[PDB]
Design a protein around this ligand. Structure first.
Ligand SMILES: [Mg+2]
Ligand SMILES: [Mg+2]
Ligand SMILES: [Mg+2]
Ligand SMILES: [Mg+2]
Ligand SMILES: [Mg+2]
Ligand SMILES: [Mg+2]
Ligand SMILES: [Mg+2]
Ligand SMILES: [Mg+2]
Ligand SMILES: [Mg+2]
Ligand SMILES: [Mg+2]
Ligand SMILES: [Mg+2]
Ligand SMILES: [Mg+2]
Ligand SMILES: [Mg+2]
Ligand SMILES: [Mg+2]
Ligand SMILES: [Mg+2]
Ligand SMILES: [Mg+2]
Ligand SMILES: [Mg+2]
Ligand SMILES: [Mg+2]
Ligand SMILES: [Mg+2]
Ligand SMILES: [Mg+2]
Ligand SMILES: [Mg+2]
Ligand SMILES: [Mg+2]
Ligand SMILES: [Mg+2]
Ligand SMILES: [Mg+2]
Ligand SMILES: [Mg+2]
Ligand SMILES: [Mg+2]
Ligand SMILES: [Mg+2]
Ligand SMILES: [Mg+2]
Ligand SMILES: [Mg+2]
Ligand SMILES: [Mg+2]
Ligand SMILES: [Mg+2]
Ligand SMILES: [Mg+2]
Ligand SMILES: [Mg+2]
Ligand SMILES: [Mg+2]
Ligand SMILES: [Mg+2]
Ligand SMILES: [Mg+2]
Ligand SMILES: [Mg+2]
Ligand SMILES: [Mg+2]
Ligand SMILES: [Mg+2]
Ligand SMILES: [Mg+2]
Ligand SMILES: [Mg+2]
Ligand SMILES: [Mg+2]
Ligand SMILES: [Mg+2]
Ligand SMILES: [Mg+2]
Ligand SMILES: [Mg+2]
Ligand SMILES: [Mg+2]
Ligand SMILES: [Mg+2]
Ligand SMILES: [Mg+2]
Ligand SMILES: [Mg+2]
Ligand SMILES: [Mg+2]
Ligand SMILES: [Mg+2]
Ligand SMILES: [Mg+2]
Ligand SMILES: [Mg+2]
Ligand SMILES: [Mg+2]
Lengths: 162, 223, 134
RNA sequence: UACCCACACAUGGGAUCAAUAGGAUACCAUAACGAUGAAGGUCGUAAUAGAAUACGAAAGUAUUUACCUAAUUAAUAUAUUAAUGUAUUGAUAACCCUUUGAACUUAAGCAUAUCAUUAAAAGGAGGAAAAGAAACUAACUAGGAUUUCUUUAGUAGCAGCGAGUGAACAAGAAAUAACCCUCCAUUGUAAUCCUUAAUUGGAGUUGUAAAUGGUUUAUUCUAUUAAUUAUUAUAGAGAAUAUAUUCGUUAUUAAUAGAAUAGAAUAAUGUACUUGAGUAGAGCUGCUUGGUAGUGCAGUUUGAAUAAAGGUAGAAUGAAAUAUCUAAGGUUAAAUAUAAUGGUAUACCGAUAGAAAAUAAGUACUGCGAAGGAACUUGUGAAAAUGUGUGGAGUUUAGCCUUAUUUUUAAGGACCCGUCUUGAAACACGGACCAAGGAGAUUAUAAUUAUAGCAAGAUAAAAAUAAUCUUUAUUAACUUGAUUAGUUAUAAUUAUAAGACCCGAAACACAGUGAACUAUACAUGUUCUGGUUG
RNA sequence: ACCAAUCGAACUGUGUGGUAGCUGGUUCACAGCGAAAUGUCUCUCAGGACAGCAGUUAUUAUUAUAUAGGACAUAGAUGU
RNA sequence: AUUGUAUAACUAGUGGGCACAUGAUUGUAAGAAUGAUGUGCAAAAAGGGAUGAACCUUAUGAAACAUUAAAUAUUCUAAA
RNA sequence: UAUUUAGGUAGCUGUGCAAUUUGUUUGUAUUGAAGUAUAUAUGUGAGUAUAUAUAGAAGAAACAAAUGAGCCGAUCUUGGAGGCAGUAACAAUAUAUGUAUAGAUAUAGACUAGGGUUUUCAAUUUAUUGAAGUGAAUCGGUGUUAUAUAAAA
RNA sequence: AAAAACAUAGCUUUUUGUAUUUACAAGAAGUGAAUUCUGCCCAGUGCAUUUGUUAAAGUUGUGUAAGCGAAUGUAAA
RNA sequence: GAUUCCUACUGUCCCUACUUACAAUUUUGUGAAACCACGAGACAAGGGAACGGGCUUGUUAUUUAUCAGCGGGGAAAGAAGACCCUGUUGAGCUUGACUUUAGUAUGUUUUAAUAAAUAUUCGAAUAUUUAUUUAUUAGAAUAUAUGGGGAGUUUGGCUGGGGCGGUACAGCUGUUAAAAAGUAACACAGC
């Protein structure tokens, strides 16, 4: 130490216990392989399931919407499904969550009608394998990132704006 | 470092380096545990902690693709590489799309014979020789020249062109640099199909427009 | 890579270990020979392993052109001895020559130990392969 | 004759160059032991047998399996009537869960601290194990079981406040799944359970309750065996022979075993209001954590309430409001970690290298014992050290530099190199001679210089087909507040930590072996012959 | 004194490539430039850090209307 | 007298010194110990003091020709 | 266009030669590649190029890349071979015809502990190979115990 | 390093009456055969015997320990 | 065992001489080691790291290339000096060195039920003591004292070598000190 440096802080056992990432491209080949092999087992059904829309907790991320975990049974009561029937279709159900507002309940209730208007139901699996219908693979109806919009207002109303 | 040696010390008219203990053979009494000793480990042993890969900026990797493509249309850049293009018709050249219906090797070989494209197949074939170094014993026995490249649109490679020596194929989507400029020089003789050549105008745009397929890319200006 | 492993590999030392340490039916098929043209019209395959006593003819090498009968077969060396050929020794030239069976084509067979049963089994299995393709 | 030099030819030795049925590293699959006798050992069997290698009196090419060995006519326990049946015991050297637990070292000394919730040692299971359905996080317009990756972050904090050590929420992803006992289960009836060929013999009211069919057809995937492949080419990967041929590659089928999905047919459907005590918490005492006056655990004394009740909300106690949850009984797939064993590849080494071993290598050989542990491939034939033949000088002077056709002599110059040192030819240390080997390379974090892309913005984070920096704007806080072109990479140098340019102590701790030499106690055996005195 | 040729704490394996302000060694050519053995602090005196002496690269001209280990003219300080 | 001057950034070695001339302190004295000013050896070639780290002439690539300094001219040994 | 500058230990910077492997381009070889030994030319120097003999199968150059990247020394590691030197230090009974006549030194023989084929014979020169050889009711062990594993007296 | 060192009988002091063993016994120390002697000192340090200072836990609250200090003996300590 | 004197006795001595055996000297056979910068001839004086084989001025040997002796020199060979000093390097041992601990002594709380007596505080609370059988494995958790029987570690610097003595180890004045500023000594006279 014979010049102008910052105070170094390097721990003694930093290089003695090391984990190396040599298997990174070989791991990503396997995960796409079992994902594609699982798709043929349930052929007409989609790969993923439905998720609700929630808000983020703190004030740093207060203006962001995000895919949550599961649907409360009261939002299913608005759409008209029962929880033993809705689990057999690709719908996730959460029971720990509590209802808070009206705006977050009318949003999720409208979203369940859009999913019901698209799915069909056959008799048995022999009938379903014979029909050739394109199988969806990504997320199911995700959120999309917003674009900000600036409103133009007249000159008179700025003295009485809110 | 397998043994259990220890230094004997001074007072014996002998060096300080660690000696193999025990007895009963020619081995006992010899040195160990040093880089200057026979059957001893080397100082600074190599390890797998060493960095094996480098990191390059994304916008620079797309520039080197855009430059080496333009060199394949230049005349003297191809001739300095070593290809024989004296009798070829016009460069760049683009054949019709109906090419991937060929199911035999005999049919695809006539297509090169229809143009004046045979001496590249022969000059690859006569140039095979041994390697000068110790790499003969390590799966690097023969080395030969490089021939024509063919860019197509199919996501699976064509089995008709696989056997001919000195012909490589590459899809339009991936576009490696290990083929378009081998050995750090540009000017490889390329042949384009129809649909792949028509996909270039979306892939790079003009000097003012942005690319929509490649996000945040624009061709550089002239200094 | 123990012995007779029969691998798909491109290394020099891995392929050569399968040539020395092969056993069983794999050692037989290394010593095969090419068919004549008129024999090819009768059966239809390309090659077949070699037994003792059938008349062969050399088609390449310093002994080109001579025709003889097979006297011995050496499985441990991949060599055979053909009649009419002489090799120099330190006393005489009466030593018969040792050749590799990839340089010879045989002209007439020798039917011993169920040889006709084996040849007719291959000719049946060949034409069924052609019917799968069309 | 000996001593010295020059040339030519022969001995001695295994360096250089070229090859290779050997090794090293990374990735993928598997993850199969044992009382129905394992792993390991001793002795035997070949027509002429020693080493190596394979095999058990059926013995050197689908059954048998000599003798020890957990080694078992047993031991610790349960069931039926001293006998019989059932379960456990041994091997491991990587990953997993508990118990016990150091010192060398750093602080330029050392005693709290660090190395360290480490090494050694003991117990217990599986192909994975452990964990897992809030007596949670927060203060928002609120989120939602467990596990793993990026980031927050070398931050809040802890500490002779010294050296040093060190977390979580929120945010972006991989993968997703929830359930069962504990009351008073229709008392118009134990409706249950083990065993027997048999309501045969029991268990059970101090409370047991357990629906059943494997037939057939089709499809997909994995593993092992067997078969056919042009000489134009769905075959230019590679080997072998000689100076134009084969095995394969490529591309197709068959057989056996295992797994999953679907159809048809055969079997089968009653009633169910349970919530966890010598626990949770107090006083004294010891360990652990970043947790600061419990973050978590344990010994001793004491020991409650039952939803009109109880717990928690990052300084202490007492009190109050507002939020948000309900402990002390049980099961659970996927995403994740790594050996023995078998495969595939490579900017790795090429016989003083690579594993100790190109394998008659854990072999020969050493030690009372725990234990220690080498040399040797095939062609070419360097130097050190010698032999024979021919030629030449002198007896007073090795080798080197300069100038000269008196160059096997003459005149001048000239102490033996490396190294500490004010100062070395030194009576200062190392070096008799040749060959081969042999010491500032790698990684993390900062800074300056050169170069490249974009620029008020910059980016290959994990993953799939966000964050950080410019700029935490100052202050301990309140009160207050515009401004120095950056960020991402490639290369060289310097600083700190890693074995850290290479070789070198006297010592300390953990786990084990010796009274054949010699010392002491106990048991059992053996211990030659002649005189003196009194 | 003795405890297997070892005894004022035996022998074998591991932590271990234990720490050393202390001895020893450190491998190719030419060209440009070129030192210190002094001051202060230190459980400091066989060792460290700051200052001094050195090297490399860079930008800029009235900071030549300027500088100097010099001299001359003028005004002064001192107690050998 | 000087064609430049001035300003920044990064980084190494060294901190055991000795001798001559002038002048001092302690000591009977010392090739003894410790300070002050200048120049050297360390790190500096050739020629002369017979020989010598510091004495006397004297600035630096490879050579040839003429002139001197320090010192010398019986002989070794160039020069009455 | 140096008519001006050029020594140098510790130390700092620039231009260049040698070795192994990787991508691209150009070329050599059975009328003879790599290695080794003697000469000649060339470079201020690290070095390079050619010629003759020997041997028998693969090696060179240019533009870029990766380092286990250049020895006289460490009482350095492993192998081979000198001087001193044929020097120190040790061994050395008589017979003209003999499986004998003499001389000389040393007490000898059985059980146990330890050794394990050294025993005996044949053939070839304290060696090498090949055969043969160990016979128990009465000679040892196997039995009893030394106040919770003990006797070849 | 074989002695002038160690041992020895002889002399003396001390602890134990709940010993698998029982005071002519079982543990701990110093001098060194026999003969003749073994003087004075308890202030210091130790050892023994006997009636000002001092912790925690418990109770509505309060109180109580050994040890140290003081007195008396003891030098073949 | 350590020390002195008489008698006898003698190569211990005056002062050495002669004989024999075994090694040695001569021949054949088996056939090593320490040591080695270079050693090619040796001296007198000089200077020099203050005792040269080599450097500078002087004086000098030589049997055809030997054999057997001898111990002046090569500051001869063996062993990284045991004596002395330094190191912020160790170990055995002692104690009124620093910090602690096994063992042991004494309190408090836990301890079978029952009845009675006595004492101390205010009908009640404490304490002491006796008797019976219905318990009786014999211990556990904390506090104070004793504790080289044990366990870790330390035990400054300057200095005409270290130790003993002094502090020239922090402040102030005059002289050393040489007419600007700056300057040493276990030098001077003092605070
Ligand atoms: Mg090695
Ligand atoms: Mg080579
Ligand atoms: Mg360490
Ligand atoms: Mg320390
Ligand atoms: Mg230290
Ligand atoms: Mg220490
Ligand atoms: Mg700890
Ligand atoms: Mg799992
Ligand atoms: Mg589990
Ligand atoms: Mg920690
Ligand atoms: Mg029930
Ligand atoms: Mg074929
Ligand atoms: Mg509850
Ligand atoms: Mg080699
Ligand atoms: Mg080896
Ligand atoms: Mg001279
Ligand atoms: Mg000295
Ligand atoms: Mg001297
Ligand atoms: Mg000496
Ligand atoms: Mg020496
Ligand atoms: Mg070398
Ligand atoms: Mg060491
Ligand atoms: Mg121990
Ligand atoms: Mg001994
Ligand atoms: Mg200079
Ligand atoms: Mg030194
Ligand atoms: Mg400095
Ligand atoms: Mg004046
Ligand atoms: Mg120096
Ligand atoms: Mg001179
Ligand atoms: Mg003189
Ligand atoms: Mg003259
Ligand atoms: Mg120079
Ligand atoms: Mg190296
Ligand atoms: Mg060498
Ligand atoms: Mg050197
Ligand atoms: Mg040697
Ligand atoms: Mg003799
Ligand atoms: Mg024999
Ligand atoms: Mg005696
Ligand atoms: Mg003696
Ligand atoms: Mg005595
Ligand atoms: Mg007496
Ligand atoms: Mg007293
Ligand atoms: Mg008295
Ligand atoms: Mg004699
Ligand atoms: Mg002399
Ligand atoms: Mg003198
Ligand atoms: Mg002599
Ligand atoms: Mg020494
Ligand atoms: Mg010191
Ligand atoms: Mg100590
Ligand atoms: Mg002690
Ligand atoms: Mg001192």
């Amino acid at each position: 130490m014979k010049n102008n440096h910052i105070l170094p802080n390097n721990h003694r056992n930093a290089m003695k216990r090391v984990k190396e990432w040599h298997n990174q491209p070989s791991r990503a080949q396997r995960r796409a392989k079992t994902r594609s092999s699982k798709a043929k087992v349930l052929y007409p059904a989609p790969l993923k399931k439905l998720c609700p829309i929630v808000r983020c907790p703190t004030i740093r991320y207060n203006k962001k919407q995000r895919l949550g975990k599961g649907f409360t049974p009261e939002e299913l009561k608005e759409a008209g499904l029962e929880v033993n029937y809705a689990r057999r279709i690709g719908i996730r159900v959460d029971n720990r969550r509590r209802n808070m507002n009206k705006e977050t309940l009318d949003l999720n209730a409208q979203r369940l009608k859009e999913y019901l208007s698209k799915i069909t139901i056959f008799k048995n699996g022999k009938e379903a394998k014979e029909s050739g219908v394109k199988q969806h693979l990504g997320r199911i109806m995700p959120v999309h990132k917003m674009t900000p919009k600036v409103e133009i207002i007249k000159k008179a109303e700025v003295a009485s704006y809110e | 470092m397998q043994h259990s040696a220890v230094s004997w010390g001074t007072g014996r008219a002998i060096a300080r380096c660690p000696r193999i203990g025990g007895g009963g053979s020619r081995r006992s009494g010899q040195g160990a545990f040093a880089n200057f000793c026979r059957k001893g480990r080397m100082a600074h042993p190599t390890t797998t902690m060493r960095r094996w890969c480098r990191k390059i900026v994304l916008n620079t990797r797309r520039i080197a693709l855009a430059m080496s493509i333009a060199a394949s249309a230049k005349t003297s850049f191809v001739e300095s590489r070593g290809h024989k293009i004296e009798n070829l018709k016009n460069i760049p050249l683009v054949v019709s799309d109906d090419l991937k219906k060929f199911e035999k090797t005999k049919d695809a070989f006539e297509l090169l014979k229809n143009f004046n494209l045979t001496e590249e197949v022969e000059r690859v074939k006569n140039s095979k020789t041994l390697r000068g170094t110790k790499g003969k014993m390590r799966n690097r026995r023969f080395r030969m020249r490089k021939g024509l490249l063919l860019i197509h649109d199919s996501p699976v490679e064509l089995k008709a062109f696989r056997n001919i020596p000195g012909v490589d194929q590459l899809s339009i989507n991936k576009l490696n640099i290990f083929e378009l400029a081998p050995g750090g020089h540009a000017g490889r003789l390329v042949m384009w199909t129809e649909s792949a050549f028509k996909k270039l105008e979306k892939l790079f745009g003009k000097f003012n427009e942005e690319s929509r397929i490649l996000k945040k890319f624009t061709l550089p200006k002239k200094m | 890579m123990l012995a007779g492993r029969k691998t798909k590999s491109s290394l020099r030392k891995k392929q050569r270990k399968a040539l020395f340490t092969a056993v069983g039916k794999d050692r037989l098929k290394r010593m095969s020979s090419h068919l004549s043209e008129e024999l090819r019209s009768q059966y239809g395959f390309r090659s077949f392993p070699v037994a003792v006593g059938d008349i062969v003819k050399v088609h390449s090498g310093p002994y080109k052109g001579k025709e003889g009968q097979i006297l011995e077969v050496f499985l441990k060396d991949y060599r055979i001895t053909v009649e009419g050929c002489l090799e120099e020794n330190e006393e005489k030239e009466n030593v018969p020559a040792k050749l590799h069976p990839c340089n010879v084509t045989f002209v007439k067979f020798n039917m011993d130990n169920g040889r006709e049963k084996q040849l007719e089994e291959k000719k049946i299995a060949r034409v069924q392969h052609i019917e799968r393709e069309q």
